[PDB]
Ligand binder design. Structure first.
Ligand SMILES: Nc1ncnc2c1ncn2[C@@H]1O[C@H](COP(=O)(O)OP(=O)(O)O)[C@@H](O)[C@H]1O
Ligand SMILES: Nc1ncnc2c1ncn2[C@@H]1O[C@H](COP(=O)(O)OP(=O)(O)O)[C@@H](O)[C@H]1O
Ligand code: ALF
Ligand code: ALF
Ligand SMILES: [Mg+2]
Ligand SMILES: [Mg+2]
Ligand SMILES: [Zn+2]
Ligand SMILES: [Zn+2]
Lengths: 650, 650
RNA sequence: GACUGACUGACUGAGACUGACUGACUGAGACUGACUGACUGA
RNA sequence: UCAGUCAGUCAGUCUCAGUCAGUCAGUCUCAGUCAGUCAGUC
């Protein structure tokens, strides 16, 4: 009620009010949600007595879903329209076939609608009259939005009434253009993909926009690395030693992988290790010596990979975290005794260099400096920090809570479900309206969190396509806000600069497109839709052995595996009941795990679980190598979809 | 005699008359009791001279038992058949082994039959020839009906004659179906669980049903809450203060429980308090300071819980009740002096806001409005009001009797035994045939009270599965009746709507099932019974220390506890005779209670009681913490079944 | 013949106490599967 | 075109806690009426 509609909202609403399928392109923070409110209200009130229509509203991430549902519920309570929502949260849900019919406004996540359409419970899209697509720029190759549109267009082009389509965006996306022409082509293809005739952008009331919406400012921070790293040097020495050990047993392995000049802390090295594994555990010999060599190479490569992960975490996260991870692996888990001696040799030196604060990670130093100086300048402010990986979320949480210098900070974690839950996310969000001052977020904090007060956005080695850049920068709804990209690589800065340009070129291309005459636009859109529909339509149309990946013991055969509930795999038979051994006090204790029978091979196959009445063990294809019963060939399967056999029920 | 059989009763009776085990599904109020009368009469009269058979009739709740017994007694007096009943009421009962043999019709409560079968006094079910199951929808996981059926089926499938089985219902129940298929599966499993081949529903004489039976109408009433509550605010301020006090002593209490964002008036907060208790009184220290901290945290948490209960009662019941409860706790029952000062500080403000009628609970306001307007419209009517908890029964009784505006109302309480007694329930029921006009009832008023005149049913925040919805709505036998769900939460309304749908989907699924061909139905039923029987058959196959929960004083040892009559626990020895102290004038006076010896700890352990000749004290495991005599570990036992020891007689 | 006292038993009616069972409602955790997109490397 | 990492989205199977309401088993008590039996004074 207290919200007073501004002029530019009416301007944007106009074409949709008329009743054409439209796309709205506006800068972040202008209040496109209120525009959707007004369009929905005007469209619904238009119908005559005795006839009513439905409204559908999607969202990708759960917190966005929750806040949109709350906004709609608060706005439309007074008119008496009944709204509702569906999500993964609702358990034992009433069948949707009629919860669509009972209510007026329905909020969803597109996967639900796609599921129902594929199953067929919802007959056709004609039950609806208005479809609103938030963050509409994602309508592309296989995103669920595009599958919904595929159903829509396949229905329209062949032979019932169809609903109006409205899309909202803050950046339509440029794709991979190298010139204005390809940007124009990409935008035209996008508009065709969702059957829109009009693109609406505010121009008449621009000046009003400038003092209504404050554009955030951008900054870069390059941080150099240390020339001398004791931990890096000693771990690299361990790398050289372990590599020599691995080299000595094998006849050759320089030649096995085409990769060359492998650095130590690079992902290329990790790919090399994975390739050497997948090439060596598949290597066969004419027999116990074969298993022994396989075991030795497996252990060597596993420790190599674990140390490489420790190195990358060390160069990203703080000093202590890498040693924590390594010590946990060693303690939790012959040759392995030798390697344990090797690590325990250096442990104390590693701890000593870790507790020397002079060798602290420079990135953390500069991040402390930025937070300190900002919070000195403004005592009160709400800032968001963006990372790549949840492990880094936990690491930064601990490091922030453990710094006496940053007594100001009050942390709040935020991440996608699976793991924080839905009500926890809702509470953390609502608290910011409160005693929290900093929010550590993963990728879910894009596409609109709408915190009314945010003046600082920090990117911790977080870059990508232009869409992510714009959606990250836009989070600073509060005026005077700033964004800081912190990194230790110049190429990242270059990518950021070129992405800024790409944004500019897209913004010019859309203005060029707006000049085109109507009904030629629609004609070329129809042509593109027809061509793409033709392309898609014509686009598409035993008893083997399984053995332990580490000791090559004959685990089982696919003739004895019965799938339960189409989604779990198990095997019956006393023969399998000897080939493994459980653990007396399993590490989770929260149920007993499976392990290789021979004391030589401590390899985790699967886990126990109980179906309705029966306790049974289940295995993962990630544990075995498959071997033909006729020939001696082998492959490796990482995922049951690739494996092909006689899938048999319980 | 004056009852004239209607057509649909004969239609329903037909399959049972033939002699197959059947289920009857009919809408509420159609007179299924008379159908049972006719089936029983026809079945009993069929036998030839010199041979006779028995009839058994169950019921769950005592008032239903009483009214069914009265109905059978009045009907079958003229034929000369001898009926009788058994229940928990009969004291010094003649042994049943032959009160079954002496009479023809026997009325019971299934727990009696299960008790006798487990003990073995009744040899086998073959003594009977007809078993009638009223409210048959309860035959499920562990309900006594299902155990009786388990005996029946275990006898039948393995290797004497067996009795016919008839069941009656008004709603078979849908379980947790999400589609018609799962509803059909649930109904098939239900029919299998009680070995029925035919489901009977009236279709030919439907039109007769519509003017014979009036369907009650349904309505919803959403009530908003007050934005500003003085009592809520002040009690919340006390919450914040007490929480700060509790926080200060303990090193950490945030991290002990995974629960987050605890609201004040929620059950989640109560669970948090219970978790903090069960985690803190078990916490051990290397000694008097340990007891002091335990006492302090105990008192803080106890007052927190009591205030939270006051808050929830206040938001449910009237203003005065919460203060009544709190004052009674404080008056009945160092640090406690401090907290008493804290409460007495605010007492007068609490009373002042309580006696301001403008801040009355809105739910009570709207309930007064509904009763007023109805009784204005119709001066004479009989209405029933449904609540969750007996405490609310008393509160509503007082509040209704104390309102000058509602001079019309004449109240009648009704609740299960243990506490009103059986003859009191019978008198209250018979009075409604009289000067009473409103009945306040707990859950016992479901599954059929059969008040010939009821035109108004009110639900005070009472919702559940579809069975409860249907059985609650059906109570309005009188035509023109109505049902009103009053609530202050929208999710409750949504649950009610989805339950209405679930009823519709079940009613369609049963009609689908009726189409199936005979002897395939029975075949799949036999398959289900066999599978379930196999599943059930294979499904199943010291001197420690006890100390005071509040002061950690060494109470006793399990080596000195002797159980009497297998059901009371006591301890002998002068050592225990010092560890406690009785009270001179105990609060019940009706016998002396037990309390902790030290004046620091006023904690009630148990109560005195006299066996045939000897006065002895008995204790409750609810009073102590158990500690190993060898190690320092502790657990908490809430119920003697969990505790395992050397149970020794007197 | 009628006067006052004490005892026993049988029948009721009412209360308080202690133990186990079932069901419904929540709140929170663990496990296994499939899908999409973005980034790299070759 | 292939590989490998990362992050989001859904489907399905499980469990533990805590409150609530019903159902049974067992040990007790106080009241009031009734009918018998005795002692003592007239
Ligand atoms: N009439 C109005 N006056 C002031 N603020 C408004 C008005 N309408 C909407 N807003 C603000 O706009 C915000 C929603 O913007 P949103 O559309 O989510 O941004 P974006 O365009 O980036 O998606 C809300 O936080 C609300 O405070
Ligand atoms: N022949 C009849 N004529 C009129 N009323 C009848 C007749 N037979 C039974 N009734 C009524 O049916 C009621 C019993 O219904 P009941 O079977 O308990 O309902 P429900 O089907 O919900 O269990 C009684 O109150 C009685 O008055
Ligand atoms: F649509 Al936005 F922040 F870009 F809510
Ligand atoms: F069986 Al009913 F009211 F449902 F007596
Ligand atoms: Mg938005
Ligand atoms: Mg009935
Ligand atoms: Zn192995
Ligand atoms: Zn004590």
């Amino acid at each position: 009620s207290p919200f007073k509609p501004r002029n530019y909202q009416l301007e944007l609403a106009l074409p949709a009010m008329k009743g054409k399928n439209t796309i709205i392109c506006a800068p972040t923070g202008c209040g496109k949600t209120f525009v959707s409110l007004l369009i929905c209200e005007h469209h619904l009130k238009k119908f005559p007595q005795g006839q009513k229509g439905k409204v559908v509203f999607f969202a990708n991430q759960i917190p966005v879903y929750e806040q949109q549902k709350s906004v709609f519920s608060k706005y439309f309570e007074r008119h008496g329209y009944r709204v509702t929502g569906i999500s993964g949260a609702t358990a034992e849900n009433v069948p949707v076939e009629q919860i669509v019919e009972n209510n007026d406004i329905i909020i969803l996540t597109p996967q639900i609608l796609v599921n129902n359409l594929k199953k067929g419970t919802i007959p056709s899209l004609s039950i609806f009259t208005l479809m609103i697509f938030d963050e509409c720029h994602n309508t592309s190759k296989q995103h669920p939005y595009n599958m919904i549109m595929f159903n829509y267009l396949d229905q329209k082009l062949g032979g019932g009434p169809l609903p109006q389509v409205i899309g909202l965006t803050a950046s339509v996306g440029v794709g991979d253009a190298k010139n204005t022409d390809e940007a124009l082509d990409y935008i035209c293809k996008l508009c065709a993909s969702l059957d829109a005739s009009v693109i609406a952008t505010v121009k008449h009331n621009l000046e009003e926009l400038e003092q209504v919406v404050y554009k955030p400012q951008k900054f870069f921070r390059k941080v150099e690395s240390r020339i001398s790293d004791k931990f890096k040097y000693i771990i690299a020495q361990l790398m050289r030693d372990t590599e020599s050990l691995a080299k000595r047993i094998c006849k050759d392995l320089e030649n096995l992988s085409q990769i060359q000049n492998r650095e130590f802390g690079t992902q290329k090295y990790e790919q090399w290790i994975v390739t050497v594994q997948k090439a060596c555990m598949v290597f066969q010999m004419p027999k116990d010596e074969e298993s022994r060599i396989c075991k030795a190479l497996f252990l060597y490569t596993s420790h190599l990979r674990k140390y490489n992960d420790a190195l990358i975490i060390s160069e990203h996260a703080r000093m202590k975290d890498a040693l924590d991870y390594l010590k946990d692996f060693f303690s939790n888990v012959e040759i392995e005794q030798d390697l344990t001696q090797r690590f325990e040799e250096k442990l104390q030196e590693l701890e000593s260099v870790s507790r020397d604060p002079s060798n602290e990670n420079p990135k953390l130093e500069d991040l402390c400096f930025i937070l300190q100086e900002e919070y000195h300048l403004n005592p009160e402010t709400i800032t968001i920090l963006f990372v790549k990986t949840r492990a880094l979320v936990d690491a930064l949480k601990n490091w922030i809570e453990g710094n006496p210098k940053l007594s100001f900070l009050k942390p709040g974690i935020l991440t996608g479900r699976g793991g924080m839950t839905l009500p926890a996310q809702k509470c953390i969000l609502d608290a910011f309206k409160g005693d929290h001052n900093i929010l550590i977020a993963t990728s879910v904090a894009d596409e609109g969190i709408d915190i009314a007060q945010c003046n600082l956005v920090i990117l911790y080695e977080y870059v990508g396509n232009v869409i992510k850049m714009i959606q990250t920068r836009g989070r600073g709804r509060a005026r005077g806000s700033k964004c800081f990209l912190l990194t230790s690589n110049a190429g990242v800065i270059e990518k950021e600069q070129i992405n800024m340009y790409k944004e500019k070129m897209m913004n010019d291309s859309i203005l060029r497109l707006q000049t085109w005459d109507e009904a030629v636009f629609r004609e070329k859109i129809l042509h593109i839709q027809t061509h793409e529909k033709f392309i898609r339509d014509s686009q598409e149309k035993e008893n083997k052995k399984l053995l332990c990946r580490k000791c090559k013991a004959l685990a089982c055969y696919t003739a004895d595996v019965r799938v339960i509930e189409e989604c779990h795999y198990t095997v019956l038979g006393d023969a399998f009941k000897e080939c493994f051994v459980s653990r007396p006090h399993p590490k989770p204790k929260k149920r007993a795990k499976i392990f290789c029978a021979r004391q030589n091979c401590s390899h985790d196959w699967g886990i126990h679980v109980k179906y309705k009445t029966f306790e049974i063990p289940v295995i993962k294809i990630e544990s075995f190598v498959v071997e033909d019963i006729a020939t001696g060939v082998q492959t490796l399967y990482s995922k049951w979809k690739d494996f092909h056999f006689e899938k048999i029920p319980f």
